[PDB]
Amino acid sequence: EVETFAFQAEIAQLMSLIINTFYSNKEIFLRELISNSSDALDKIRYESLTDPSKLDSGKELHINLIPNKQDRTLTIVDTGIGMTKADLINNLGTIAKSGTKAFMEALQAGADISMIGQFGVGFYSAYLVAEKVTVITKHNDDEQYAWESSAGGSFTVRTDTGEPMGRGTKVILHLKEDQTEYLEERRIKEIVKKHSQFIGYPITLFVEK
Numbered sequence: 331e332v333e334t335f336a337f338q339a340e341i342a343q344l345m346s347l348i349i350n351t352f353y354s355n356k357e358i359f360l361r362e363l364i365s366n367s368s369d370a371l372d373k374i375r376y377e378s379l380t381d382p383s384k385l386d387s388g389k390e391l392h393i394n395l396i397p398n399k400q401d402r403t404l405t406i407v408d409t410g411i412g413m414t415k416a417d418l419i420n421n422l423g424t425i426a427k428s429g430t431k432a433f434m435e436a437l438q439a440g441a442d443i444s445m446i447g448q449f450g451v452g453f454y455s456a457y458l459v460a461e462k463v464t465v466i467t468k469h470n471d472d473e474q475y476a477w478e479s480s481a482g483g484s485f486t487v488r489t490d491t492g493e494p495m496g497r498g499t500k501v502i503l504h505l506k507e508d509q510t511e512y513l514e515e516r517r518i519k520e521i522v523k524k525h526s527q528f529i530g531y532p533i534t535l536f537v538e539k
């Protein structure tokens with residue numbers, strides 16, 4: 331059973347801007363997704379201080395980067411707090427509406443796309459390099475879900491039947507045909523060292539078989 335939803339008009343507009351603006355510094359997508367993972371890990375860590383049972387779904391707090399050349403995907407996995415169905419459909423979009431309006435105002439005033447994370451909508455920088463994004467996520471209070479969008483104004487949510495995750499989020503970037511440099515180990519290593527060197531959780535870059 332697959333549900334299809336329309337993005338808010340403002341978020342659809344943000345996604346088209348990211349897809350259509352000429353902007354060569356695409357590598358910042360990875361900084362933004364790792365930053366989101368670090369924030370989700372911070373959240374479950376803080377909650378566990380007053381309720382240790384919140385880590386019954388997994389004690390390890392980490393980020394994995396998994397390239398796959400056969401599938402042309404780059405996957406960012408974290409064992410953070412995860413997202414509920416309400417997060418995926420309503421809550422994040424509500425917050426993202428005001429962040430988007432501020433980001434667009436900043437751009438017309440001379441800011442550039444690399445400052446997107448200051449406005450809370452850094453996730454959508456994934457569309458700098460991905461033609462489709464799939465998000466698998468599991469929050470302690472809800473079921474495991476799969477969110478998906480190729481932009482175009484809509485996204486889907488379904489209950490995920492795949493491998494159970496325990497807790498956290500997997501962002502699967504289906505890369506554009508001309509963005510396969512982000513599957514190469516040396517390139518990912520370079521980007522992590524440049525933009526994510528002080529993240530306070532272990533980042534493991536998997537290597538391809």
Ligand SMILES: N#Cc1ccnc(N2CCCCC2)c1
Pocket residue numbers: 366418422423425426429450451452453454465477
């Ligand atoms: N602004 C914004 C924002 C921040 C974090 N995550 C999201 N997401 C990704 C999961 C499903 C769609 C919404 C949006």
